[PDB]
Amino acid sequence: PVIQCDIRQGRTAEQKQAMAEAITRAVHETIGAPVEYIYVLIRETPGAHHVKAGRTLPEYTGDG
Amino acid sequence: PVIQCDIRQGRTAEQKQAMAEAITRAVHETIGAPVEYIYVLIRETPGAHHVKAGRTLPEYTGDG
Amino acid sequence: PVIQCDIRQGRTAEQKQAMAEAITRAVHETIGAPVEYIYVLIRETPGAHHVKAGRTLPEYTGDG
Amino acid sequence: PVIQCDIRQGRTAEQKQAMAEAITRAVHETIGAPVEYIYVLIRETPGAHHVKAGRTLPEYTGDG
Amino acid sequence: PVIQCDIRQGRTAEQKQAMAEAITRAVHETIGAPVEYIYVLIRETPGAHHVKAGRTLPEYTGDG
Amino acid sequence: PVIQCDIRQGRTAEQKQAMAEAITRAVHETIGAPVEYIYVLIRETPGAHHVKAGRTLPEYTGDG
């Protein structure tokens, strides 16, 4: 399967790889797709390019 | 974030919901996206519509 | 530009055409894309294939 | 619903937000999707990455 | 790479496989992507779901 | 039809245009879509954003 992830910019390389590995496991385990068939694609955009219910999303920083 | 999942047809409603929930948790935990921001979208296609490295994928049946 | 619209199944042909025309006008008027460059693509899915903030969306019926 | 907008780079932040708000209204009004379900995603690319009928599209500047 | 092909319904299984193979060869030969990395995904929609320059596309029948 | 090409960064403008023209011909010839209906969209990402079978893809350089 193809899993496309349009996420906000600002995560580390390690966070994005952790996401891709967790999604790969999740897909394999829940729908029985072989790992060899799984293709995860990550695309980053600014928060302003995510407009949900008419409102832009804030920039991600991980500050909390 | 938007997570699009192009998977082969033939899974049960329970399998697809399990996948969507597991992806939601995976994205939340690895990149810190609030659950409220996550949108998972599932599309089903025949196996013949997945052509990886020049080869058609088989149909998913749940059997093996 | 390409505008992909993943919507829930159940709308009439007239509703979907109205949406495509309104999006075409909206894109033309707000960002100055010539109408000739605009391509709107509509895909329908069951409500269960839309999982937002962990929750499945209901089926669209036209009633309420 | 998910509305993905692959547009050419070069618009202002205000033009892109106007587009996302107009698309949100257009979708809500034509197919009856609640605003809370609507997720607009904007991606920018160079004109050379839009190849329509075999021809690349020019860069957008808004000059006219 | 991922190559998504949103085409109008009505083609034979042989036509769609021919398209996927020809795209695989085209991508391999022009940008040097190894065949092993290429994933082609085909989705079919009614002609009415393709609205280009404000106009609906006709249904594909194989006749003319 | 819409053909979306998510490829790794690092190709020349000429390689990407050759790809788009070859895909346009391939689609026209195999499924009979008129060239005027064909819209190819190219998006570039780092190799680390392509995670296939759990493994990131290397950066493309064309060195061989």
mmCIF file of C-alpha atoms in Angstrom:
data_model
loop_
_atom_site.group_PDB
_atom_site.id
_atom_site.type_symbol
_atom_site.label_atom_id
_atom_site.label_comp_id
_atom_site.label_asym_id
_atom_site.label_seq_id
_atom_site.Cartn_x
_atom_site.Cartn_y
_atom_site.Cartn_z
ATOM 1 C CA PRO A 1 0.000 0.000 0.000
ATOM 2 C CA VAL A 2 0.951 3.670 -0.310
ATOM 3 C CA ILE A 3 0.741 5.794 2.859
ATOM 4 C CA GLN A 4 1.108 9.541 2.202
ATOM 5 C CA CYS A 5 1.807 11.731 5.238
ATOM 6 C CA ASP A 6 1.344 15.485 4.765
ATOM 7 C CA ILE A 7 2.699 16.892 8.027
ATOM 8 C CA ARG A 8 3.804 20.291 9.249
ATOM 9 C CA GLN A 9 7.500 21.151 8.945
ATOM 10 C CA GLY A 10 9.731 21.348 12.024
ATOM 11 C CA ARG A 11 10.248 17.737 13.167
ATOM 12 C CA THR A 12 13.670 16.149 13.399
ATOM 13 C CA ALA A 13 14.826 13.441 11.007
ATOM 14 C CA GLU A 14 14.517 10.963 13.883
ATOM 15 C CA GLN A 15 10.889 11.900 14.608
ATOM 16 C CA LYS A 16 9.933 11.466 10.947
ATOM 17 C CA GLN A 17 11.693 8.103 10.697
ATOM 18 C CA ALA A 18 10.038 6.953 13.931
ATOM 19 C CA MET A 19 6.696 7.954 12.404
ATOM 20 C CA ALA A 20 7.372 6.047 9.182
ATOM 21 C CA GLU A 21 8.446 2.920 11.068
ATOM 22 C CA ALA A 22 5.438 3.069 13.416
ATOM 23 C CA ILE A 23 3.059 3.518 10.469
ATOM 24 C CA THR A 24 4.703 0.603 8.650
ATOM 25 C CA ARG A 25 4.221 -1.645 11.686
ATOM 26 C CA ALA A 26 0.664 -0.385 12.228
ATOM 27 C CA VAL A 27 -0.344 -1.116 8.629
ATOM 28 C CA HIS A 28 1.346 -4.536 8.604
ATOM 29 C CA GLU A 29 -0.289 -5.564 11.885
ATOM 30 C CA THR A 30 -3.849 -4.283 11.295
ATOM 31 C CA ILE A 31 -4.555 -5.145 7.629
ATOM 32 C CA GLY A 32 -1.973 -7.861 6.999
ATOM 33 C CA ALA A 33 -0.081 -6.090 4.242
ATOM 34 C CA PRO A 34 3.441 -7.534 3.908
ATOM 35 C CA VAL A 35 6.120 -5.049 4.931
ATOM 36 C CA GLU A 36 7.634 -5.429 1.445
ATOM 37 C CA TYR A 37 4.476 -3.884 -0.096
ATOM 38 C CA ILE A 38 4.404 -0.823 2.194
ATOM 39 C CA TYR A 39 5.606 2.550 0.878
ATOM 40 C CA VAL A 40 5.414 5.557 3.225
ATOM 41 C CA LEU A 41 5.879 9.009 1.719
ATOM 42 C CA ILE A 42 6.427 12.088 3.908
ATOM 43 C CA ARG A 43 5.755 15.649 2.735
ATOM 44 C CA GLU A 44 6.332 18.730 4.910
ATOM 45 C CA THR A 45 4.500 22.048 4.623
ATOM 46 C CA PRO A 46 4.141 25.176 6.761
ATOM 47 C CA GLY A 47 1.288 25.269 9.240
ATOM 48 C CA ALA A 48 -0.363 27.997 7.154
ATOM 49 C CA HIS A 49 -0.821 25.431 4.371
ATOM 50 C CA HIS A 50 -3.042 23.301 6.665
ATOM 51 C CA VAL A 51 -6.463 24.971 6.852
ATOM 52 C CA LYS A 52 -8.836 22.887 8.980
ATOM 53 C CA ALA A 53 -12.426 24.069 9.472
ATOM 54 C CA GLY A 54 -11.367 27.377 7.935
ATOM 55 C CA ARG A 55 -8.525 27.983 10.426
ATOM 56 C CA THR A 56 -4.808 27.754 9.709
ATOM 57 C CA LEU A 57 -2.778 25.491 11.930
ATOM 58 C CA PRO A 58 0.117 26.888 13.989
ATOM 59 C CA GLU A 59 3.740 26.185 13.210
ATOM 60 C CA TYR A 60 5.110 23.092 14.934
ATOM 61 C CA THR A 61 8.049 23.659 17.282
ATOM 62 C CA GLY A 62 7.723 20.880 19.859
ATOM 63 C CA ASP A 63 7.951 23.498 22.607
ATOM 64 C CA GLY A 64 5.631 22.652 25.466
ATOM 65 C CA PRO B 1 -1.785 16.221 9.307
ATOM 66 C CA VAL B 2 -3.408 14.238 6.494
ATOM 67 C CA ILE B 3 -2.566 10.523 6.218
ATOM 68 C CA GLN B 4 -3.820 8.980 2.968
ATOM 69 C CA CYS B 5 -3.850 5.177 2.853
ATOM 70 C CA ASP B 6 -4.230 3.557 -0.577
ATOM 71 C CA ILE B 7 -4.763 -0.108 0.293
ATOM 72 C CA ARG B 8 -5.990 -3.161 -1.569
ATOM 73 C CA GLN B 9 -9.688 -4.020 -1.255
ATOM 74 C CA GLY B 10 -10.904 -6.985 0.790
ATOM 75 C CA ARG B 11 -10.346 -6.010 4.430
ATOM 76 C CA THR B 12 -13.168 -5.958 6.956
ATOM 77 C CA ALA B 13 -14.575 -2.767 8.439
ATOM 78 C CA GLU B 14 -12.897 -3.767 11.705
ATOM 79 C CA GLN B 15 -9.447 -4.135 10.109
ATOM 80 C CA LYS B 16 -9.657 -0.726 8.414
ATOM 81 C CA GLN B 17 -10.803 0.988 11.620
ATOM 82 C CA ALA B 18 -7.999 -0.731 13.542
ATOM 83 C CA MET B 19 -5.549 0.580 10.949
ATOM 84 C CA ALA B 20 -6.899 4.130 11.142
ATOM 85 C CA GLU B 21 -6.745 4.132 14.944
ATOM 86 C CA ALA B 22 -3.234 2.657 15.033
ATOM 87 C CA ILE B 23 -1.999 5.229 12.507
ATOM 88 C CA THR B 24 -3.620 8.025 14.523
ATOM 89 C CA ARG B 25 -1.802 6.865 17.669
ATOM 90 C CA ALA B 26 1.473 6.365 15.770
ATOM 91 C CA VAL B 27 1.399 9.870 14.284
ATOM 92 C CA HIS B 28 0.395 11.462 17.605
ATOM 93 C CA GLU B 29 3.149 9.679 19.541
ATOM 94 C CA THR B 30 6.053 10.084 17.093
ATOM 95 C CA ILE B 31 5.681 13.676 15.813
ATOM 96 C CA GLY B 32 3.473 15.264 18.462
ATOM 97 C CA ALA B 33 0.555 16.097 16.201
ATOM 98 C CA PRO B 34 -2.518 16.630 18.398
ATOM 99 C CA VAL B 35 -5.132 13.966 17.782
ATOM 100 C CA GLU B 36 -7.559 16.779 16.916
ATOM 101 C CA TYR B 37 -5.368 17.706 13.896
ATOM 102 C CA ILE B 38 -5.108 14.179 12.454
ATOM 103 C CA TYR B 39 -7.205 13.132 9.447
ATOM 104 C CA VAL B 40 -6.798 9.577 8.115
ATOM 105 C CA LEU B 41 -8.327 8.803 4.724
ATOM 106 C CA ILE B 42 -8.635 5.249 3.369
ATOM 107 C CA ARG B 43 -9.068 4.380 -0.310
ATOM 108 C CA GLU B 44 -9.439 0.816 -1.616
ATOM 109 C CA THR B 45 -8.341 -0.439 -5.030
ATOM 110 C CA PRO B 46 -7.990 -3.835 -6.695
ATOM 111 C CA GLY B 47 -4.620 -5.490 -6.346
ATOM 112 C CA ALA B 48 -4.127 -5.096 -10.104
ATOM 113 C CA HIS B 49 -4.060 -1.311 -9.609
ATOM 114 C CA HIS B 50 -0.904 -1.613 -7.462
ATOM 115 C CA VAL B 51 2.078 -2.150 -9.769
ATOM 116 C CA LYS B 52 5.298 -2.256 -7.743
ATOM 117 C CA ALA B 53 8.642 -2.751 -9.509
ATOM 118 C CA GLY B 54 6.707 -3.568 -12.677
ATOM 119 C CA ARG B 55 4.674 -6.364 -11.050
ATOM 120 C CA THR B 56 0.981 -6.388 -10.198
ATOM 121 C CA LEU B 57 0.121 -7.112 -6.581
ATOM 122 C CA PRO B 58 -2.248 -10.003 -5.809
ATOM 123 C CA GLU B 59 -5.763 -9.595 -4.486
ATOM 124 C CA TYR B 60 -6.146 -9.502 -0.715
ATOM 125 C CA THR B 61 -8.479 -12.254 0.530
ATOM 126 C CA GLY B 62 -7.753 -12.631 4.252
ATOM 127 C CA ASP B 63 -6.681 -16.225 3.482
ATOM 128 C CA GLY B 64 -3.205 -17.566 2.800
ATOM 129 C CA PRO C 1 -3.389 23.708 -10.496
ATOM 130 C CA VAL C 2 -4.776 20.344 -9.383
ATOM 131 C CA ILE C 3 -7.541 20.342 -6.748
ATOM 132 C CA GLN C 4 -8.261 16.856 -5.391
ATOM 133 C CA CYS C 5 -11.494 16.489 -3.420
ATOM 134 C CA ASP C 6 -11.880 13.342 -1.304
ATOM 135 C CA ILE C 7 -15.522 13.513 -0.221
ATOM 136 C CA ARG C 8 -17.993 11.084 1.294
ATOM 137 C CA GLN C 9 -20.276 9.204 -1.107
ATOM 138 C CA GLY C 10 -23.980 10.006 -1.414
ATOM 139 C CA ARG C 11 -24.149 13.384 -3.167
ATOM 140 C CA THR C 12 -26.053 13.879 -6.404
ATOM 141 C CA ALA C 13 -24.363 14.522 -9.735
ATOM 142 C CA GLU C 14 -25.663 18.090 -9.493
ATOM 143 C CA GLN C 15 -24.099 18.693 -6.062
ATOM 144 C CA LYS C 16 -20.688 17.407 -7.180
ATOM 145 C CA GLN C 17 -20.742 19.517 -10.354
ATOM 146 C CA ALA C 18 -21.768 22.564 -8.311
ATOM 147 C CA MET C 19 -18.819 21.895 -6.010
ATOM 148 C CA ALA C 20 -16.366 21.531 -8.893
ATOM 149 C CA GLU C 21 -17.582 24.750 -10.518
ATOM 150 C CA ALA C 22 -17.507 26.701 -7.248
ATOM 151 C CA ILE C 23 -13.972 25.488 -6.506
ATOM 152 C CA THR C 24 -12.884 26.423 -10.034
ATOM 153 C CA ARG C 25 -14.227 29.960 -9.554
ATOM 154 C CA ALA C 26 -12.741 30.206 -6.044
ATOM 155 C CA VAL C 27 -9.265 29.175 -7.209
ATOM 156 C CA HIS C 28 -9.407 31.452 -10.268
ATOM 157 C CA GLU C 29 -10.513 34.477 -8.236
ATOM 158 C CA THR C 30 -8.212 34.123 -5.208
ATOM 159 C CA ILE C 31 -4.846 33.100 -6.728
ATOM 160 C CA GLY C 32 -5.235 34.145 -10.357
ATOM 161 C CA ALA C 33 -4.899 30.696 -11.876
ATOM 162 C CA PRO C 34 -6.377 30.811 -15.390
ATOM 163 C CA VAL C 35 -9.474 28.654 -15.655
ATOM 164 C CA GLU C 36 -7.716 26.762 -18.463
ATOM 165 C CA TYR C 37 -5.053 25.571 -15.961
ATOM 166 C CA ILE C 38 -7.492 24.293 -13.313
ATOM 167 C CA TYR C 39 -8.197 20.564 -12.935
ATOM 168 C CA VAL C 40 -10.638 19.459 -10.216
ATOM 169 C CA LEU C 41 -10.759 15.754 -9.387
ATOM 170 C CA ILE C 42 -13.472 14.226 -7.180
ATOM 171 C CA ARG C 43 -13.149 10.893 -5.372
ATOM 172 C CA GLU C 44 -15.912 9.370 -3.228
ATOM 173 C CA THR C 45 -15.413 7.092 -0.228
ATOM 174 C CA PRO C 46 -17.629 5.691 2.520
ATOM 175 C CA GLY C 47 -17.851 7.765 5.661
ATOM 176 C CA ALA C 48 -16.059 4.974 7.535
ATOM 177 C CA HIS C 49 -12.954 5.672 5.427
ATOM 178 C CA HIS C 50 -12.704 9.196 6.902
ATOM 179 C CA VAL C 51 -11.226 8.939 10.402
ATOM 180 C CA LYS C 52 -10.743 12.414 11.878
ATOM 181 C CA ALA C 53 -9.271 12.809 15.373
ATOM 182 C CA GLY C 54 -9.662 9.054 15.827
ATOM 183 C CA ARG C 55 -13.398 9.064 15.029
ATOM 184 C CA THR C 56 -15.145 7.684 11.961
ATOM 185 C CA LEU C 57 -17.315 10.132 10.052
ATOM 186 C CA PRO C 58 -20.977 9.240 9.447
ATOM 187 C CA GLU C 59 -22.441 8.379 6.073
ATOM 188 C CA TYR C 60 -23.778 11.276 4.024
ATOM 189 C CA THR C 61 -27.465 10.804 3.160
ATOM 190 C CA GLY C 62 -28.756 14.254 2.181
ATOM 191 C CA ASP C 63 -31.161 13.982 5.148
ATOM 192 C CA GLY C 64 -30.727 15.288 8.677
ATOM 193 C CA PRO D 1 -13.475 15.961 3.330
ATOM 194 C CA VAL D 2 -9.854 16.487 2.292
ATOM 195 C CA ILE D 3 -9.178 19.120 -0.391
ATOM 196 C CA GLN D 4 -5.602 19.037 -1.736
ATOM 197 C CA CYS D 5 -4.471 22.077 -3.730
ATOM 198 C CA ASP D 6 -1.274 21.678 -5.767
ATOM 199 C CA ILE D 7 -0.636 25.222 -6.986
ATOM 200 C CA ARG D 8 2.298 27.078 -8.473
ATOM 201 C CA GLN D 9 4.579 28.966 -6.079
ATOM 202 C CA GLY D 10 4.583 32.771 -5.959
ATOM 203 C CA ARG D 11 1.304 33.763 -4.263
ATOM 204 C CA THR D 12 1.198 35.774 -1.064
ATOM 205 C CA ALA D 13 0.130 34.273 2.253
ATOM 206 C CA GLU D 14 -3.081 36.303 1.978
ATOM 207 C CA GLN D 15 -3.935 34.920 -1.475
ATOM 208 C CA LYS D 16 -3.450 31.337 -0.279
ATOM 209 C CA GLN D 17 -5.564 31.897 2.834
ATOM 210 C CA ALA D 18 -8.281 33.553 0.737
ATOM 211 C CA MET D 19 -8.212 30.480 -1.512
ATOM 212 C CA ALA D 20 -8.502 28.079 1.425
ATOM 213 C CA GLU D 21 -11.398 30.028 2.941
ATOM 214 C CA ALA D 22 -13.232 30.279 -0.398
ATOM 215 C CA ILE D 23 -12.783 26.542 -1.016
ATOM 216 C CA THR D 24 -14.031 25.774 2.500
ATOM 217 C CA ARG D 25 -17.166 27.853 1.909
ATOM 218 C CA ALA D 26 -17.654 26.381 -1.574
ATOM 219 C CA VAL D 27 -17.465 22.801 -0.292
ATOM 220 C CA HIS D 28 -19.730 23.502 2.695
ATOM 221 C CA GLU D 29 -22.351 25.216 0.531
ATOM 222 C CA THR D 30 -22.442 22.811 -2.448
ATOM 223 C CA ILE D 31 -22.225 19.336 -0.849
ATOM 224 C CA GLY D 32 -23.336 20.089 2.707
ATOM 225 C CA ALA D 33 -20.154 19.002 4.440
ATOM 226 C CA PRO D 34 -19.907 20.613 7.896
ATOM 227 C CA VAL D 35 -17.076 23.130 8.114
ATOM 228 C CA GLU D 36 -15.640 21.086 11.003
ATOM 229 C CA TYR D 37 -15.029 18.141 8.617
ATOM 230 C CA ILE D 38 -13.201 20.192 5.958
ATOM 231 C CA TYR D 39 -9.399 20.010 5.713
ATOM 232 C CA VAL D 40 -7.684 22.037 2.968
ATOM 233 C CA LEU D 41 -4.037 21.288 2.234
ATOM 234 C CA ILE D 42 -1.918 23.607 0.062
ATOM 235 C CA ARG D 43 1.268 22.500 -1.708
ATOM 236 C CA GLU D 44 3.403 24.823 -3.852
ATOM 237 C CA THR D 45 5.631 23.777 -6.750
ATOM 238 C CA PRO D 46 7.455 25.545 -9.583
ATOM 239 C CA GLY D 47 5.590 25.988 -12.842
ATOM 240 C CA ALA D 48 7.986 23.522 -14.485
ATOM 241 C CA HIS D 49 6.543 20.800 -12.239
ATOM 242 C CA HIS D 50 3.080 21.297 -13.818
ATOM 243 C CA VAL D 51 3.116 19.637 -17.248
ATOM 244 C CA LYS D 52 -0.311 19.915 -18.886
ATOM 245 C CA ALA D 53 -0.862 18.378 -22.331
ATOM 246 C CA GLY D 54 2.904 17.929 -22.544
ATOM 247 C CA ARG D 55 3.694 21.622 -21.920
ATOM 248 C CA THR D 56 5.187 23.108 -18.766
ATOM 249 C CA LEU D 57 3.292 25.929 -17.147
ATOM 250 C CA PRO D 58 4.926 29.349 -16.690
ATOM 251 C CA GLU D 59 5.997 30.700 -13.336
ATOM 252 C CA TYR D 60 3.300 32.684 -11.546
ATOM 253 C CA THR D 61 4.142 36.311 -10.765
ATOM 254 C CA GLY D 62 0.767 38.064 -10.762
ATOM 255 C CA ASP D 63 2.177 40.631 -13.186
ATOM 256 C CA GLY D 64 -0.413 41.623 -15.751
ATOM 257 C CA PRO E 1 9.060 6.991 -6.442
ATOM 258 C CA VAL E 2 5.261 6.902 -6.245
ATOM 259 C CA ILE E 3 3.296 7.516 -9.463
ATOM 260 C CA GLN E 4 -0.430 7.995 -8.829
ATOM 261 C CA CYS E 5 -2.666 7.774 -11.898
ATOM 262 C CA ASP E 6 -6.226 9.090 -11.539
ATOM 263 C CA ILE E 7 -7.863 7.943 -14.776
ATOM 264 C CA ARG E 8 -11.417 7.638 -16.029
ATOM 265 C CA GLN E 9 -13.112 4.248 -15.638
ATOM 266 C CA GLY E 10 -13.766 1.964 -18.606
ATOM 267 C CA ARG E 11 -10.346 0.651 -19.652
ATOM 268 C CA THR E 12 -9.576 -3.055 -19.814
ATOM 269 C CA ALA E 13 -7.247 -4.803 -17.389
ATOM 270 C CA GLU E 14 -4.775 -5.098 -20.268
ATOM 271 C CA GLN E 15 -4.801 -1.350 -21.002
ATOM 272 C CA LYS E 16 -4.199 -0.437 -17.350
ATOM 273 C CA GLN E 17 -1.345 -2.941 -17.016
ATOM 274 C CA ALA E 18 0.182 -1.632 -20.252
ATOM 275 C CA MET E 19 -0.015 1.879 -18.812
ATOM 276 C CA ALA E 20 1.597 0.861 -15.522
ATOM 277 C CA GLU E 21 4.429 -0.947 -17.308
ATOM 278 C CA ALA E 22 5.033 1.919 -19.743
ATOM 279 C CA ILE E 23 5.121 4.439 -16.886
ATOM 280 C CA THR E 24 7.532 2.208 -14.959
ATOM 281 C CA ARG E 25 9.880 2.085 -17.962
ATOM 282 C CA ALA E 26 9.491 5.828 -18.607
ATOM 283 C CA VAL E 27 10.353 6.757 -15.015
ATOM 284 C CA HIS E 28 13.278 4.309 -14.883
ATOM 285 C CA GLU E 29 14.758 5.563 -18.161
ATOM 286 C CA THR E 30 14.334 9.329 -17.686
ATOM 287 C CA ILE E 31 15.279 9.903 -14.017
ATOM 288 C CA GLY E 32 17.243 6.765 -13.176
ATOM 289 C CA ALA E 33 14.927 5.471 -10.478
ATOM 290 C CA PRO E 34 15.630 1.752 -10.009
ATOM 291 C CA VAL E 35 12.663 -0.353 -11.045
ATOM 292 C CA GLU E 36 12.669 -1.804 -7.516
ATOM 293 C CA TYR E 37 11.844 1.677 -6.110
ATOM 294 C CA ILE E 38 8.908 2.399 -8.445
ATOM 295 C CA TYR E 39 5.310 2.065 -7.229
ATOM 296 C CA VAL E 40 2.497 2.856 -9.686
ATOM 297 C CA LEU E 41 -1.006 3.223 -8.262
ATOM 298 C CA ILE E 42 -4.115 3.412 -10.467
ATOM 299 C CA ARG E 43 -7.454 4.860 -9.357
ATOM 300 C CA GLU E 44 -10.556 4.969 -11.573
ATOM 301 C CA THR E 45 -13.323 7.569 -11.417
ATOM 302 C CA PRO E 46 -16.312 8.492 -13.572
ATOM 303 C CA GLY E 47 -15.675 11.093 -16.226
ATOM 304 C CA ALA E 48 -18.000 13.459 -14.351
ATOM 305 C CA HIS E 49 -15.483 13.517 -11.482
ATOM 306 C CA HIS E 50 -12.859 15.108 -13.771
ATOM 307 C CA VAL E 51 -13.679 18.806 -14.162
ATOM 308 C CA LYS E 52 -11.008 20.526 -16.256
ATOM 309 C CA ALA E 53 -11.270 24.261 -16.981
ATOM 310 C CA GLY E 54 -14.794 24.164 -15.557
ATOM 311 C CA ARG E 55 -15.973 21.404 -17.920
ATOM 312 C CA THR E 56 -16.806 17.801 -17.089
ATOM 313 C CA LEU E 57 -14.912 15.170 -19.048
ATOM 314 C CA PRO E 58 -16.901 12.551 -20.986
ATOM 315 C CA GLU E 59 -17.076 8.889 -20.073
ATOM 316 C CA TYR E 60 -14.425 6.643 -21.590
ATOM 317 C CA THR E 61 -15.976 3.824 -23.642
ATOM 318 C CA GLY E 62 -13.192 2.522 -25.896
ATOM 319 C CA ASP E 63 -15.359 3.594 -28.865
ATOM 320 C CA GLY E 64 -15.256 6.833 -30.826
ATOM 321 C CA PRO F 1 -6.159 12.184 -16.154
ATOM 322 C CA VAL F 2 -3.948 13.403 -13.309
ATOM 323 C CA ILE F 3 -0.525 11.749 -12.935
ATOM 324 C CA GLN F 4 1.249 12.649 -9.672
ATOM 325 C CA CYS F 5 4.966 11.846 -9.488
ATOM 326 C CA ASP F 6 6.555 11.941 -6.025
ATOM 327 C CA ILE F 7 10.252 11.534 -6.811
ATOM 328 C CA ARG F 8 13.487 12.085 -4.940
ATOM 329 C CA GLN F 9 15.190 15.467 -5.334
ATOM 330 C CA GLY F 10 18.414 15.822 -7.327
ATOM 331 C CA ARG F 11 17.417 15.441 -10.998
ATOM 332 C CA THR F 12 18.024 18.150 -13.561
ATOM 333 C CA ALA F 13 15.207 20.181 -15.089
ATOM 334 C CA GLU F 14 15.789 18.283 -18.339
ATOM 335 C CA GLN F 15 15.430 14.865 -16.679
ATOM 336 C CA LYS F 16 12.145 15.883 -15.044
ATOM 337 C CA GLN F 17 10.756 17.295 -18.291
ATOM 338 C CA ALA F 18 11.821 14.149 -20.159
ATOM 339 C CA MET F 19 9.968 12.130 -17.515
ATOM 340 C CA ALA F 20 6.810 14.225 -17.842
ATOM 341 C CA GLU F 21 6.843 13.975 -21.639
ATOM 342 C CA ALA F 22 7.466 10.208 -21.579
ATOM 343 C CA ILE F 23 4.643 9.702 -19.064
ATOM 344 C CA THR F 24 2.317 11.845 -21.186
ATOM 345 C CA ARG F 25 3.077 9.732 -24.263
ATOM 346 C CA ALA F 26 2.795 6.490 -22.277
ATOM 347 C CA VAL F 27 -0.633 7.412 -20.898
ATOM 348 C CA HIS F 28 -1.917 8.645 -24.271
ATOM 349 C CA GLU F 29 -0.742 5.501 -26.067
ATOM 350 C CA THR F 30 -1.839 2.835 -23.546
ATOM 351 C CA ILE F 31 -5.271 4.042 -22.345
ATOM 352 C CA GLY F 32 -6.253 6.397 -25.163
ATOM 353 C CA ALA F 33 -6.527 9.543 -23.080
ATOM 354 C CA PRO F 34 -6.211 12.637 -25.300
ATOM 355 C CA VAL F 35 -3.023 14.578 -24.620
ATOM 356 C CA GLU F 36 -5.187 17.630 -23.851
ATOM 357 C CA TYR F 37 -6.672 15.811 -20.812
ATOM 358 C CA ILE F 38 -3.307 14.786 -19.313
ATOM 359 C CA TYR F 39 -1.899 16.713 -16.337
ATOM 360 C CA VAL F 40 1.429 15.553 -14.868
ATOM 361 C CA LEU F 41 2.456 16.951 -11.492
ATOM 362 C CA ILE F 42 5.999 16.510 -10.140
ATOM 363 C CA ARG F 43 6.887 16.771 -6.444
ATOM 364 C CA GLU F 44 10.431 16.362 -5.094
ATOM 365 C CA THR F 45 11.376 15.159 -1.614
ATOM 366 C CA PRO F 46 14.555 13.970 0.107
ATOM 367 C CA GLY F 47 15.303 10.265 0.010
ATOM 368 C CA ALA F 48 14.674 10.096 3.765
ATOM 369 C CA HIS F 49 11.023 10.951 3.076
ATOM 370 C CA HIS F 50 10.630 7.735 1.020
ATOM 371 C CA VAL F 51 10.373 4.818 3.459
ATOM 372 C CA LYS F 52 9.826 1.558 1.567
ATOM 373 C CA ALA F 53 9.451 -1.693 3.522
ATOM 374 C CA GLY F 54 10.605 0.221 6.594
ATOM 375 C CA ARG F 55 13.870 1.427 5.000
ATOM 376 C CA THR F 56 14.667 4.965 3.891
ATOM 377 C CA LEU F 57 15.803 5.422 0.330
ATOM 378 C CA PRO F 58 19.218 6.946 -0.432
ATOM 379 C CA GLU F 59 19.667 10.403 -1.872
ATOM 380 C CA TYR F 60 19.716 10.492 -5.667
ATOM 381 C CA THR F 61 22.892 11.852 -7.260
ATOM 382 C CA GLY F 62 23.079 10.072 -10.616
ATOM 383 C CA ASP F 63 26.644 9.040 -9.791
ATOM 384 C CA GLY F 64 27.347 5.536 -11.014
#
